[PDB]
C-alpha cells in the first residue's frame, strides 16, 4: 500500500 499523505508538514530538525 502507498503511504498516507500527511495532515501537515513535519518540522525541520532543530540543529
Amino acid at each position, epitope marked *: 500500500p502507498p503511504p498516507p499523505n500527511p*495532515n501537515d508538514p*513535519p518540522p*525541520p*530538525n532543530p540543529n
Partner: antibody
Amino acid sequence: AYLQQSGAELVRSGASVKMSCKASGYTFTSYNMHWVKQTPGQGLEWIGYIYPGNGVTNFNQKFKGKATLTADTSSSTAYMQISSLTSEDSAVYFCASAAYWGQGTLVTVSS
Amino acid sequence: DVVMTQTPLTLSVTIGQPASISCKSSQSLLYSDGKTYLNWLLQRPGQSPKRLISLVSELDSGVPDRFTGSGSGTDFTLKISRVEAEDLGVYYCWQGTHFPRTFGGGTKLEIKR
C-alpha cells in the same frame, strides 16, 4: 493502520494525568503525532503535536504551560501529560497521526 | 488564529441524494512548499474520527469514490455524489498550514428515511 489509546481515568483537581497512544501499521517517526481535545458539544481543539522523528513539539498557546508531549520510538508510543487539572479539563482526548485517529481517552476530573 | 467556518451546520438527506459541505478559512492555506494542507474527517456517531481526504482532494485508502474534495486558497468543498446510509455523523475540516492547527465547527449529516 491503527492508534490504540490507554484507558479512561479518574483524576483529582490539581493533580496530573498521563495517557498513551500506541501506533502500528505506519512509519511512526514519519508523521506529526497530534493530540486533540473534544468538547462535550462536538468541538475539536488542537493541543499540540510531537514529531517522533526528531522530538520537536509545537503547542497551542492555551495548553503550553500544562501539556507535555513525548514519544518513544522503540515502542512506537506517544504520550501526553496534563498537569494542574481543573474542571474544564474533563474531556475525551484523541491522538491523531497520518490517516488514523485513536479511539480516545476519557478523563474525569473529580474529587 | 486561522478560523475555519463550515456550513451548513446540519444536512438532512435521503438515501441517494447529493450532499455538499463548505469550509472557508480566514487566511490562505497554501504553504510555502506549494501544498495546501486541508483535511476532511468524519466522526460517525459513537466512534472516533476517521480521515477521508487530505491535501484538499486526495482520498485516503478505503474511502469510496463518491466522496470528492476540491477548492483552493480559502474556499474548500467536500461533496458526496449519492449519500449512503453509512455516511452519517459529523464532518470536520481542519488545516495543517498555520499555527495553531484549527478545526471547523462540524457538519452533522443525518438520514431521512
